[PDB]
């Protein structure tokens, strides 16, 4: 009922009390481990006041007035809310608190230390996509700040009936554009060949190239959505070059600043906001390894071997590793270079050994999940490998969602 | 009840029933996931039946003899020799079939398409822990086969009352031995520095160097153990040498041939084997990451990277990665140059998904323990990062147990 995480690298062991809040159900049971499992799995006014209920007495437990006064009125308020609309309204306050939880509790994150310094956006004023492109771009400058990231979330009106929803149709604000080839290869990102597809469907005109920006998708109040481009002063971008290999130019390789994922729910008590886009500044893993490696991306570790003068015909010559090193030294190195916030696996990590160690100190636990925590990389040279954790999900969360063209009841 | 692991770099799905199998529990329940947990967790004859009537139905559907004359007849066999003696014994045959599946079970392993070409020493008639030594050294021997390592366990008497115990004191058979220093720091390896310690305590001459072959501690039917040492002409080992850096030499570095664990307990049909070493073949990583690379380890990163002229100042150059992916390739090259049995991290993670798809045709599923199958270095690109594993424990099975200085009545 009180367990114990072990640290196997220092010996240090914490103890999880947090887990015991935990109410949501994690695919794993008695006889089987579901951990590795990528995506494990319209509400009523029954259900919503345990959980408005729930929310509210951690939100007044957390700023030192736990059943007082203001949260015994504030329960009734929602209450007769829900009974009146079978919904009910967050404060600006309860917004904010909640989105910075949600965060908090993001066991996949290894990011978590700063889950405090977010900015919340509050978008629940817009109607129209036009008003979520605004929304969006205001974000988009707001969070890149010039290189200077700074984390931010923008909430959408929350989900009312469920045909009346709120959805960025892509995956992260900024994308690069994927395109399908002739001889069945692909320029630009594997990643979102269907996404840059169902732009031009939509209507986009496709400069089908390598690293072209994708138009946002937006998806106001159910209706169909409406293709909008970010303004390019907007979208920063980082040429990747390396500090010895000068034919590192000559590959030709940018990534933009800003990852800012738009396809996630936010929940806060019971609320559902399908469209909730947040960003904070890239590991440099994700790009260099993920991004640029893995085999259905943008699989560049075919040139960076052989400029490099790589044995290519042994799979044990570890010509794979060698180039996968040398690119993820260039992206953290132009990024840097750049005064664009970076952070490498090695700090992010320990930052998030740190982090743990507060949060079972001051909250009783930590939720993460280690197979998405180590990082894609050298995973035992950093100090989560050797860290024991206990995966758990707590609310306010960040849950998956489907992707909206899978889902919507289209018209025109 | 039927479920589904996706590839998400190759899109290739398949269908779990082995599952269903399975009967021990994993430490996860609905609420909570512990897959990352390091080791999460006397015997009775009504235990005993079930677990023996389970395992021979299992063996006898596996030599298309299912619960026809001889296995009913077996059934009654071990029956009765329960009733009668309260405990029982395995045919040979039983016993190899038992030994081959812990292996094929063991979730953790990633070497496991080689399973059912594992050699089956039967030391169930020693009685000494001198007899031990002669198999364990036997064993050595025939697993090395001059550098063209060969799977193999020797497998010792089965627990009886509990005090009559065989055990390896050994983690493995052979292990370097680790020497605490006046001014703190640690000669050798440091992970076996207790282990060091509690052999001069029976009575070991350390000749306190670096890569010094530990003895054996046997212990027998529940005696005292004793020390032997291992003729150094049966413990092969491999000079590290790098195929560039020719500095890799003034490293003067070493690691043994055979990766031999001694201090895990094999379950066969309820009856507990509590000493069974067993050996394959290193993959590289074992040895090049974790031997030498680990903090609490070798932790050699120090001069790798200061020969090869890298910026130590800065944690973001990756001056730690860079020297872990050359020292990698020096094991590689050392061991393949030397005609020893060795495997890099992307044949081995290769081989076990297609080891996979094996199992999940012709057994149903195939259990895995995702946080233990990718390897410490370059995890995202192996083909075992993007795999989705389900981890359940089948049986027979390997079983951590207790170090035996922590549970044995000592007398003398
Ligand atoms: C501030 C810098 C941040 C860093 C360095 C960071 C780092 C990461 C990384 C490396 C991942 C793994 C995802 C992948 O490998 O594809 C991740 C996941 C995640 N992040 Fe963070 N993050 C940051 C900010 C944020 C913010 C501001 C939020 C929310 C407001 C957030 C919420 C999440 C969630 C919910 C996931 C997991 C979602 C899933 O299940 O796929 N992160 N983060
Ligand atoms: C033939 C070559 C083999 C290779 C390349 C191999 C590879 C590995 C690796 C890399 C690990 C992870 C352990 C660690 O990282 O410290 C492992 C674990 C394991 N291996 Fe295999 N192995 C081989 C043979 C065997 C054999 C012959 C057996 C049993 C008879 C076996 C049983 C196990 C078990 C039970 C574990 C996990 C034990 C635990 O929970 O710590 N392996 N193997
Ligand atoms: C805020 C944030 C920052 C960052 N630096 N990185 C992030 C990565 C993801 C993310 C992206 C893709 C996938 C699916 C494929 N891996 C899962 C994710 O969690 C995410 F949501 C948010 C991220
Ligand atoms: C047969 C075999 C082959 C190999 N090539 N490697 C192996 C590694 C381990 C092993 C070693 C240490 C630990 C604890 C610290 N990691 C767990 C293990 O499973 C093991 F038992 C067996 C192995
Ligand atoms: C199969 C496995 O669940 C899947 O590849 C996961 C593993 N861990 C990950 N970890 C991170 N950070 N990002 C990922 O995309 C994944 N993918
Ligand atoms: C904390 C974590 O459970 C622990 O470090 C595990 C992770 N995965 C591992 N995987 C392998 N192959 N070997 C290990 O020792 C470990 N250690
Ligand atoms: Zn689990």
Redesign the interface.
Known sequence: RF?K??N???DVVLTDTL?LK?????????????????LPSVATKDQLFPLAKEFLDQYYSSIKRFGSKAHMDRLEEVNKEIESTSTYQLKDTELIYGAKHAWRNASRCVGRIQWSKLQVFDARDCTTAHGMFNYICNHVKYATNKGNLRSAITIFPQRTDGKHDFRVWNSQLIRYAGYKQPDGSTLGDPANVQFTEICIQQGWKAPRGRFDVLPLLLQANGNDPELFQIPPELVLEVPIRHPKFDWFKDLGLKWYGLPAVSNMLLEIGGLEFSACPFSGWYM?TEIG??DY????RYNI?EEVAKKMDLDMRK????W???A??EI??AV?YSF?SDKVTIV?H??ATESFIKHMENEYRCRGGCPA???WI????????TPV?H???????LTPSFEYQPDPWNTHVWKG
Chains 1, 2 share one sequence.
């Open positions: 367990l995480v072990k196997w690298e220092t887990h935990s109410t949501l159900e994690t695919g794993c049971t008695e006889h089987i481990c579901m951990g590795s499992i990528m440099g390894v993920r490696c893995d085999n259905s570790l799979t044990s010559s570890l794979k590793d060698q996968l090193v993820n030294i953290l840097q490498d090695h700090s999940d280690w197979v180590v990082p894609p990389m050298s995973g035992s040279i490998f860290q024991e954790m206990l995966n758990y999900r």
